[PDB]
Amino acid sequence: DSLAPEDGSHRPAAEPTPPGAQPTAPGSLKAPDTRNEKLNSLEDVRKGSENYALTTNQGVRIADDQNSLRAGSRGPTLLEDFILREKITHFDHERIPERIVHARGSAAHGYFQPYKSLSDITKADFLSDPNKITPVFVRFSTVQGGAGSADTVRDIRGFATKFYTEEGIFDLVGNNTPIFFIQDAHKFPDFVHAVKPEPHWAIPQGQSAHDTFWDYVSLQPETLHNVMWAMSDRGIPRSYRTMEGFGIHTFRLINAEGKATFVRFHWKPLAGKASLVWDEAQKLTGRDPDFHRRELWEAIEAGDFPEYELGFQLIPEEDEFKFDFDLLDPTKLIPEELVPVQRVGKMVLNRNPDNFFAENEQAAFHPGHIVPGLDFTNDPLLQGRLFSYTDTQISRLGGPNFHEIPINRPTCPYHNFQRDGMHRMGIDTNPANYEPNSINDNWPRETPPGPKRGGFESYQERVEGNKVRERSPSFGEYYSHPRLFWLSQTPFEQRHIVDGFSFELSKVVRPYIRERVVDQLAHIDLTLAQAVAKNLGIELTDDQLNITPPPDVNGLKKDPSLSLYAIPDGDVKGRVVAILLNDEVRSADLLAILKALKAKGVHAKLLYSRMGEVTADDGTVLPIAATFAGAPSLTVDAVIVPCGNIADIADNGDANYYLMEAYKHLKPIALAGDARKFKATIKIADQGEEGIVEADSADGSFMDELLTLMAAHRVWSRIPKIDKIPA
Amino acid sequence: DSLAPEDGSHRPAAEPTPPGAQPTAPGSLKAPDTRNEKLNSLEDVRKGSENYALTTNQGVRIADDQNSLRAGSRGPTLLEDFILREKITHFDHERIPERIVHARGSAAHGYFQPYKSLSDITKADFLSDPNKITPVFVRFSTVQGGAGSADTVRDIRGFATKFYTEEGIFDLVGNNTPIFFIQDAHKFPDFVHAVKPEPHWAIPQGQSAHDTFWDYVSLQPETLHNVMWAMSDRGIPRSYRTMEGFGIHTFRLINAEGKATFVRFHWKPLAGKASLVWDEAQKLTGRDPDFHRRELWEAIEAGDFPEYELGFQLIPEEDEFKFDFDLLDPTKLIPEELVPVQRVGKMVLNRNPDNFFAENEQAAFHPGHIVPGLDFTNDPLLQGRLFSYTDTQISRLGGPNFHEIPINRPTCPYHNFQRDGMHRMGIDTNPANYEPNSINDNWPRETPPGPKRGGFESYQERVEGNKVRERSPSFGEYYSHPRLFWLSQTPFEQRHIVDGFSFELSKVVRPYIRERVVDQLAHIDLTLAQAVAKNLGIELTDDQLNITPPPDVNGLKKDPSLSLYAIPDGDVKGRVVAILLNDEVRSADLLAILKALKAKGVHAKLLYSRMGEVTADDGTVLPIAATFAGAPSLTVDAVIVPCGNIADIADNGDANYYLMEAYKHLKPIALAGDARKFKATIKIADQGEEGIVEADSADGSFMDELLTLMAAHRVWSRIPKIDKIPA
Numbered sequence A, B: 001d002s003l004a005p006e007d008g009s010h011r012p013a014a015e016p017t018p019p020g021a022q023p024t025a026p027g028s029l030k031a032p033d034t035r036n037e038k039l040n041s042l043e044d045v046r047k048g049s050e051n052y053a054l055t056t057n058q059g060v061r062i063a064d065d066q067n068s069l070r071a072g073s074r075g076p077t078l079l080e081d082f083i084l085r086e087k088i089t090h091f092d093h094e095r096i097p098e099r100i101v102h103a104r105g106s107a108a109h110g111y112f113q114p115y116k117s118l119s120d121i122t123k124a125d126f127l128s129d130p131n132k133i134t135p136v137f138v139r140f141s142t143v144q145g146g147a148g149s150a151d152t153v154r155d156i157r158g159f160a161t162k163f164y165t166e167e168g169i170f171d172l173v174g175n176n177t178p179i180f181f182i183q184d185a186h187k188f189p190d191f192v193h194a195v196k197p198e199p200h201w202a203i204p205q206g207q208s209a210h211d212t213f214w215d216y217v218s219l220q221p222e223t224l225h226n227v228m229w230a231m232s233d234r235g236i237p238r239s240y241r242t243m244e245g246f247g248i249h250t251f252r253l254i255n256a257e258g259k260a261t262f263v264r265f266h267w268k269p270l271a272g273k274a275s276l277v278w279d280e281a282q283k284l285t286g287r288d289p290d291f292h293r294r295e296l297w298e299a300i301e302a303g304d305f306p307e308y309e310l311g312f313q314l315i316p317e318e319d320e321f322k323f324d325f326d327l328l329d330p331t332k333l334i335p336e337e338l339v340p341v342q343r344v345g346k347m348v349l350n351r352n353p354d355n356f357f358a359e360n361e362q363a364a365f366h367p368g369h370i371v372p373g374l375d376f377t378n379d380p381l382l383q384g385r386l387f388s389y390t391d392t393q394i395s396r397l398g399g400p401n402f403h404e405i406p407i408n409r410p411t412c413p414y415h416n417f418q419r420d421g422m423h424r425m426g427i428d429t430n431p432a433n434y435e436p437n438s439i440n441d442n443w444p445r446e447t448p449p450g451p452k453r454g455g456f457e458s459y460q461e462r463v464e465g466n467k468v469r470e471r472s473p474s475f476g477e478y479y480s481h482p483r484l485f486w487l488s489q490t491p492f493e494q495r496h497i498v499d500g501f502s503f504e505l506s507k508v509v510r511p512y513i514r515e516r517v518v519d520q521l522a523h524i525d526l527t528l529a530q531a532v533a534k535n536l537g538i539e540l541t542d543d544q545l546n547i548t549p550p551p552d553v554n555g556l557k558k559d560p561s562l563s564l565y566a567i568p569d570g571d572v573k574g575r576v577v578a579i580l581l582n583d584e585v586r587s588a589d590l591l592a593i594l595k596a597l598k599a600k601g602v603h604a605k606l607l608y609s610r611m612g613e614v615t616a617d618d619g620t621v622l623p624i625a626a627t628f629a630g631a632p633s634l635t636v637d638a639v640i641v642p643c644g645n646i647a648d649i650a651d652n653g654d655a656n657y658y659l660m661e662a663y664k665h666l667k668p669i670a671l672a673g674d675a676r677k678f679k680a681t682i683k684i685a686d687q688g689e690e691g692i693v694e695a696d697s698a699d700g701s702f703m704d705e706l707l708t709l710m711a712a713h714r715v716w717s718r719i720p721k722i723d724k725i726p727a
Ligand code: HDD
Pocket: A099, A100, A101, A102, A105, A139, A140, A141, A157, A158, A159, A160, A173, A174, A175, A180, A184, A185, A188, A247, A248, A249, A330, A363, A364, A365, A381, A382, A384, A385, A386, A388, A389, A390, A392, A393, B088, B092
């Protein structure tokens, strides 16, 4: 009709803007100048809308899209209304099966580039030159929950990267923990059925806190290592930008000379490692179930591109048997103290999709999608994964032509003798649909392996043994890796692990399952088992107290790279601060606050007891982003309260609770001038306490002190003090 | 190996048990004696498990379900492992498309029976005899969220009932509010796309609180009536057992004489009407996203069978045009003050399904599934619905044989000349697959319409008009029903409506959309418009302040049946109380508490600071249901704190917070003996306060008081005292 506002405020500016400043929008409209080879190749299918007539799918203009065709304006709808039927038909068949696992995920486009050529250890074209840019499409996910489930659950996270290389698609399909729960792919359905919602009633969603999961874990000790990781704060990342990524399996790099090197893939978050705390994470699934999806999208819209460093743990073929654990066992990590991660390149995620369904929901990643220069190993979990990811998209994406769905298409050439199949897009002109043929002079043709642009040939690994359904005896060790993880965590991390297990086991209705898990914990570490047992009202038996702890892992009694926080790696850029306003804010405090934050790339959200505007002491009109209840402290990293008319919000329950919640969840709090009246709400001594910034004004070192606290992420020293606190 | 506990505690007793007393289980194992014709008919496909060998789907016994077949124990997985491939293949294809709308839902089996024969107004067989029982299967749902989204969101709820009658399946596919948002089915995709997650980033899940929903609403005033209902506490029901159900459209009843009577269908909850409050509902989506699903399942396991009374609003054909609204407009309700709801029969849900996927997920309901004695009308929304529910299951349920999926099968005879289609189960022996035929003597044959067991014949409604895509002028009135609804709500219901709109519109990023919605509210009621505007920091113009309110609906200035709470309808059976234990509970208090609760069918959950057990003062061992943090006050209807060693929990942060949350959410709280010292936490009253029960001990009087409070659901008089509380 011409419904947009005449001031053009319905449309977000096509420039980087901080979270909440503008309505979010499709990537190609928000950042039209951000391009890459894959984004450019999608232009043949992108469809605009502005200034076009509304039509049917057959191109017929529609005159009246408000009404069905009927006999009389109060009459029956007629079967001849083809416009109505096409429209309802398309609607009626919008949904496709969600992914069996990792159904909940958020994605973005980006690019990768190696730091140096890796030609000495791999012939993979995408790693051959520092000036070779490879477009990527990354999808981060949870594991258990459906596509409509919440983001901040306690779960493993998926981290899948599609590399659109010149020699084929390479999908690095990893998780955020360096091991998996099980050893052989044959048990995948068992483990997944145990963690997913129980079959009689389909409860619970997005949670391993239920009987069948802990029943399985209790009977399958190989799971304990990844369970330790999920029970730690690793299971509740602050954002996809602040978690590590791992390929888990040992793969092979193959160079031009034919040498095979064992490799484990790593992704290091350039924003650092950071996680929530359980109470915050759980409440946040309620206050904002889309928190991670939203945060990823807004980071990219703000120019805070998620950046990751690809790294390789490399192990020579001659060292295959030199560790206490098997290199092919996916339940075992390779300690970085033994084999360092060598930095390989950087990945930058800089553009959101246009249409979530078309690009994210239909994206298909599969770890079998490798390119010359890479190869597999006999890891029995990886081996079975290779079967699943091609199979599953026959139903998920309707057939074998899923590589023709725009997001999945290679940007490099693809030609073969495969034909037909549902939804076939490619119209083949080859006279032949078979090889060998003479009628097209045998094109397209096979290509011999070679240093560059050659055909794929598997590494000639020696195979020797009988046909058996047998677990290698080298895989039968289940407690040393769990113990190594435990011992590498800080004391507050251990506490959170103890709390994770305790909370989850408390949701297990059958008490014997809790007892059985406690017995397993006693094989890992007595302190851990005792603390969990104590929280479950369970007493360890004398036998349990005397279980000998598992051996160190190759002499290591800890590896600090396993902790999120043991070694500081703080990065404040992209974090956000809640600013609690009053109706006569000291504008000077606000100016100092906002400019300090902006200088470090830290965002702010101005909150009040209503929407609209408030006027500062000097007449400055302050736009309100949200109310105290509307954007809870769960969604920010720190809270600042400027001086002004504090009596306005002093007796506001929501404003007081805002600080209590943020205080309980160990976030930095800064009070200027009369805002110090709120110290009594969080019980802060006159003298002050580490973790609370306070001064007569927001000047001098007030902002630097708060930013130092944000750099450390959370105020771990406050844990004992939050123990009480009714919040 | 891995086997059941010696003591048999892995398996739930097969008898009615209170929530939490036993692990939940498949219905046929929990209540094997609960039968009905439909449940029995599902016995052909029910599959046991105990004492049977594990096999492939082809019936081959599996020796080792722990490993893939490989060449050597550390070798490559072989392609000949068909056991692994079948198992992984079935896993890979588990998911089916979720429903386009109402994907989130919970179901149960039950039975219905009319109070008396309705043969004078309808020939429908299921309403013909008070002693003839009809098996039902009911699915309750939300609308917007995916199948993995949360239960206690703010949304409309679906209430679909499949009646397995002797003359065909009758599906009564309704919602929990008496009107829908839109008038013509052609706009269904528009409305649903606006409320669903926005297309660029697929946010937000299970929420209408986003720009596109309010944009659509602001441009389509026909939506305002159902929006009023959604924003009231109707949008966040306490349970599926405590909400009304409505068919929305005017349908027809056809008797044996051929007389048509207009009818609107109602379901009255025999447990009464009850809703949560927003803060509670929203937090509960995070603490227990499966709350309604769980609550329904547990109610049925406990014997608190959800019971509903079917009721009809009947309007003679000659009264079609006598209201000031069109009877065929689904955005208009029929005030009970004008046309009373006649009681028709009772529906009882007494058995949970066995497998959620097979029975709930694959259930197909469709409002076109009617039987002789019922008929449609020209309601333009209902008309388009008839097209869509058959159409959508061709993708959702994989084909046209969805009536052969066990839960969907009619229990009466079904014979026709339709053949084939994907996964055809029925093997037809008829020599003929067409009619007329002589080769099978024309069987199965058509049946003339008649008083009973007759063929379906449409009511011969007179149709007169030109072929038009036009809305009836009579549907062009959008503010009087919204205003009637507003004026019928109690003062606290009005405030919660105000808060609903305010909260939602505060999440609309484009400010002009908020203003346009406020403008629409000014057309309904200025008090309402002004209260919302104040919260958004918006000022009504002088023009807006002078908008004439819409006319009363046929002289009505209010209709108390539109309110949840104006007319007392409380029922405590099935409700649940949290009991905060201490390590030396005064058993005399507990005895009295449990006895009084038990006499009214109210359940209890014993909570503590840890799991396991605590021993009362008389040696009674009390098993702990959950921790204070583990089963928040959100999940209960009231909180009781018995005396004993109060020092044990007096300083516990979670225990204190438990009471503050319950207090803020207007729930009855009862404190006996030294537990009255908790009154300081909820900072209020010394002489007592209506809503807080206190006494030296828990006695008959104390429990009567608490139970009387529970019968009124929430303590609305405490509203003014809760916005200072920091919780
Ligand atoms: C044999 C089965 C199997 C096993 C053993 C694995 N999974 Fe897998 N996973 C699948 C079968 C599968 C799947 C059914 O094929 C999925 C679901 C739908 C899809 O396209 O792929 C998939 C999805 C999937 C995704 C989502 C890709 C997306 O965003 O689309 C990730 C990140 C992982 N998996 C990661 C892993 C890791 C790191 C594993 C252990 C090392 C693992 N999976 C074990």
